[PDB]
Amino acid sequence: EVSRISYEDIGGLSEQLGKIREMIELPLKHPELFERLGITPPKGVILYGPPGTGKTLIARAVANESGANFLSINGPEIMSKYYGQSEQKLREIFSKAEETAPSIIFIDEIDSIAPKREEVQGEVERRVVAQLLTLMDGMKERGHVIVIGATNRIDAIDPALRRPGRFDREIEIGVPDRNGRKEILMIHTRNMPLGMSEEEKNKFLEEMADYTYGFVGADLAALVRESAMNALRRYLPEIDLDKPIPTEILEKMVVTEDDFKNALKSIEPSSLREVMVEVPNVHWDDIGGLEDVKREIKETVELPLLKPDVFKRLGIRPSKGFLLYGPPGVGKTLLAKAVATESNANFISIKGPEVLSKWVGESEKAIREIFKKAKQVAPAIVFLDEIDSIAPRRGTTSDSGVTERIVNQLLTSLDGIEVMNGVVVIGATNRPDIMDPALLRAGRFDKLIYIPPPDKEARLSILKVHTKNMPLAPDVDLNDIAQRTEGYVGADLENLCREAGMNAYRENPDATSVSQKNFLDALKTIRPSVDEEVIKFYRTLSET
């Protein structure tokens, strides 16, 4: 190849690349190791990954990493060639391989050549499928050619092409790690203006890029393409004026860093199918009271997220998660989110009903991918709110395959938490009893965080924080309204401050800051919600 692509080009994948090195690259260099000792290396290998990683470019750099003769044919063009001018291609490349060994047979998107499992029937489809299949069979298990390929998905070929001994060693390459992304974007920075070497800009760009959880290799490259374009807008008022182009601009293109950030705004980062909320901004300060809980929540979360290691030095075994239980949505969701904000750790909130209506086709594989995605996005806190909803008592009869498929997959996936994994499960539920106790058994949830309903003192604190948006009148006395009744939860008090506005807008035709009277009327509008019957329910349920 004319422009040989060293590791450093697709670099930042080094973790994953070390797999590749040790897996496919070694036999491709000298098979003698595996040939002499242990199982024969598979000569068909697929690099599987979430669609795109600059698909081709990944394996194109593995080709030249081994330095093996970069024989390329690609799926679109494999079936482009005429009937029986397709057939001679394959054989020609393979023969050219056998001569030039090490030779990396690089065929990509082999899903495109052989798609449907058996719903393919095509003339050429069986011809070329067979040819490659047979070209795989014909081999010398010392003839230094391997066949690398890519696909977007494991199921995306004929089972014949998966058949053991014919494409079967498997390598997953996902979304690049935050620092790794820098390397990639750095390589693309070589073309780009930044104006100077600016290790500082590089560091800025580093955290700039971390401002998004990710973009894939291709997508990263689009971010940079955007910057250029976007920055060319900045220079659109200056340049246009000079109808014949000036070469004075040759260093009057120096992208302004804010351009990158502004391109970052609107570029639809990544292309992930499922929602991936990052870390919310809700500070501990924004929580409605519960200073005590904060001290405890910090030590509960922080020990697992921040420092597993030192506990193994003692010899104690940390927990495997926790559940929140108490009066429904006291800003439950806010408590969880809060702890996650202050922790750098990504938060994932995938709503309990969402997953229960979401399946990969009435099939639990979506949940198994949820945990997978969580593992991948780690350090992170997966949050399942209404965990009851995703796993009620297995005695529920609405469930049929719900329990078999998903609840048990959930079970094993919750068990899937490991000390090495950075995931932490913050479950939250309104009524525990509804939930399947297997999730409350050892090896899963361990503690149930009771939330006392809003105290008089805490009403004040939820109130100051909430009314931060609203303008208050000199007339207001905030501690008064708190003291008027503790009879509310946080969620209604949200609406309380709101409802004050609703009343108020009627009162003052054009709005003027909420007043004691505006609060009073609204106080008597909302019904109390802190049932002394339910507090006792949880009080007694605190035994369990």
Question: Does residue 284 touch a second copy according to CB under 8 A?
Answer: no
Q: Give the Cα separation of 536 and 544 in Å (integer).
A: 13
Question: Does residue 70 touch a second copy according to CB under 8 A?
Answer: no
Q: Does 321 show up as a binding residue in the annotation?
A: no
Q: Does 50 show up as a binding residue in the annotation?
A: yes
Q: Does 53 show up as a binding residue in the annotation?
A: yes
Question: Does residue 7 touch a second copy according to CB under 8 A?
Answer: no
* Listed ranges 99-107, 195-203, 305-313, 339-347: which one lies at the site for a second copy (CB under 8 A): 305-313
Q: Does 329 show up as a binding residue in the annotation?
A: yes
Question: Does residue 485 touch a second copy according to CB under 8 A?
Answer: no
* Listed ranges 205-213, 279-287, 306-314, 336-344: which one lies at the site for a second copy (CB under 8 A): 306-314
Position among 190, 197, 314, 540 found at the interface with a second copy (CB under 8 A): 314
Within 13 Å and on the Cβ side, how many CA atoms surround 192?
28
Question: Does residue 122 touch a second copy according to CB under 8 A?
Answer: yes
Helix axis angle for 87-100 and 123-137, nearest 10°, is 20
Q: Does 328 show up as a binding residue in the annotation?
A: yes
Question: Does residue 502 touch a second copy according to CB under 8 A?
Answer: yes
* Listed ranges 95-103, 158-166, 453-461, 475-483: which one lies at the site for a second copy (CB under 8 A): 158-166
Position among 11, 102, 280, 328 found at the interface with a second copy (CB under 8 A): 328
Q: Does 331 show up as a binding residue in the annotation?
A: yes
Where in 40-59 is the site for a second copy (CB under 8 A)?
A: 51-52
End-to-end CA separation in angstroms for the chain: 68
Report the chain's C-alpha Rg in angstroms.
30
Question: Does residue 115 touch a second copy according to CB under 8 A?
Answer: yes
Residue 482 burial (10 A CB sphere; 0-12, 13-18, 19+): buried
Question: Does residue 344 touch a second copy according to CB under 8 A?
Answer: no
Question: What DSSP element (H or E) covers 170?
Answer: strand 169-172
Q: Which candidate, 131, 141, 132, 134, places its Cα nearest to that of 46?
A: 132
Q: Classify residue 405 by its DSSP letter.
A: I
Residue whose token pair is 């690049």: 176
From residue 52, give the alpha-carbon distance in Å to each of 151, 218, 270. Answer: 9, 7, 10
Contact 47, 215 (CB under 8 A): no
Return the number of the residue (355 or 423) whose C-beta is nearest a second copy. Answer: 355
Q: Does 326 show up as a binding residue in the annotation?
A: yes
Where in 399-438 is the site for a second copy (CB under 8 A)?
A: 399-405, 407-412, 415, 437-438
Return the number of the residue (180 or 217) whose C-beta is nearest a second copy. Answer: 217
CB atoms under 10 Å from CB of 412, counted, come to 10
From residue 259, give the alpha-carbon distance in Å to each of 179, 189, 205, 255, 451. Answer: 21, 14, 12, 7, 45
Q: Give the Cα separation of 371 and 384 in Å (integer).
A: 11
Q: Which candidate, 55, 156, 141, 57, places its Cα nearest to that of 101?
A: 141
Where in 160-199 is the site for a second copy (CB under 8 A)?
A: 160, 163-165, 168, 191-193
Position among 101, 130, 194, 272 found at the interface with a second copy (CB under 8 A): 130
Q: Strand, helix or coil at 347?
A: strand
Return the number of the residue (483 or 512) whose C-beta is nearest a second copy. Answer: 512
Which residues are CB-neighbours of 524 under 8 A, at least 6 positions away? none
Question: Does residue 90 touch a second copy according to CB under 8 A?
Answer: no
Q: Give the Cα separation of 339 and 424 in Å (integer).
A: 12
Distance in Å, CB of 501 to a second copy, minimum: 3
* Listed ranges 28-36, 59-67, 373-381, 473-481: which one lies at the site for a second copy (CB under 8 A): 28-36
Q: Does 18 show up as a binding residue in the annotation?
A: no
Q: Does 51 show up as a binding residue in the annotation?
A: yes
Where in 372-401 is the site for a second copy (CB under 8 A)?
A: 386, 389, 392-401
Distance in Å, CB of 283 to a second copy, minimum: 19
Question: Does residue 239 touch a second copy according to CB under 8 A?
Answer: yes
Contact 456, 289 (CB under 8 A): no
Beta-strand pair 145-151/103-106: parallel
Q: Give the Cα separation of 107 and 93 in Å (integer).
A: 10
Position among 452, 529, 537, 541 found at the interface with a second copy (CB under 8 A): 529
CB atoms under 10 Å from CB of 118, counted, come to 8
Which residues are CB-neighbours of 424 under 8 A, at least 6 positions away? 301, 304, 305, 321, 345, 380, 381, 382, 417
Distance in Å, CB of 11 to a second copy, minimum: 19
* Listed ranges 279-287, 336-344, 361-369, 457-465: which one lies at the site for a second copy (CB under 8 A): 361-369
Where in 205-234 is the site for a second copy (CB under 8 A)?
A: 218-219, 221-222, 225, 228-229, 231-233
Question: Does residue 315 touch a second copy according to CB under 8 A?
Answer: yes
Which residues are CB-neighbours of 296 under 8 A, at least 6 positions away? 449
Distance in Å, CB of 479 to a second copy, minimum: 19
Return the number of the residue (238 or 483) whose C-beta is nearest a second copy. Answer: 238
Distance in Å, CB of 475 to a second copy, minimum: 15
Position among 203, 236, 273, 433 found at the interface with a second copy (CB under 8 A): 236
Residues 313, 315, 320, 325, CA torsion sign: negative
Residue whose token pair is 């529920």: 396
Distance in Å, CB of 412 to a second copy, minimum: 5
Q: Which residues are annotated as a binding site?
A: 49-56, 326-333
Q: Which residues are annotated as a binding site for ATP?
A: 49-56, 326-333
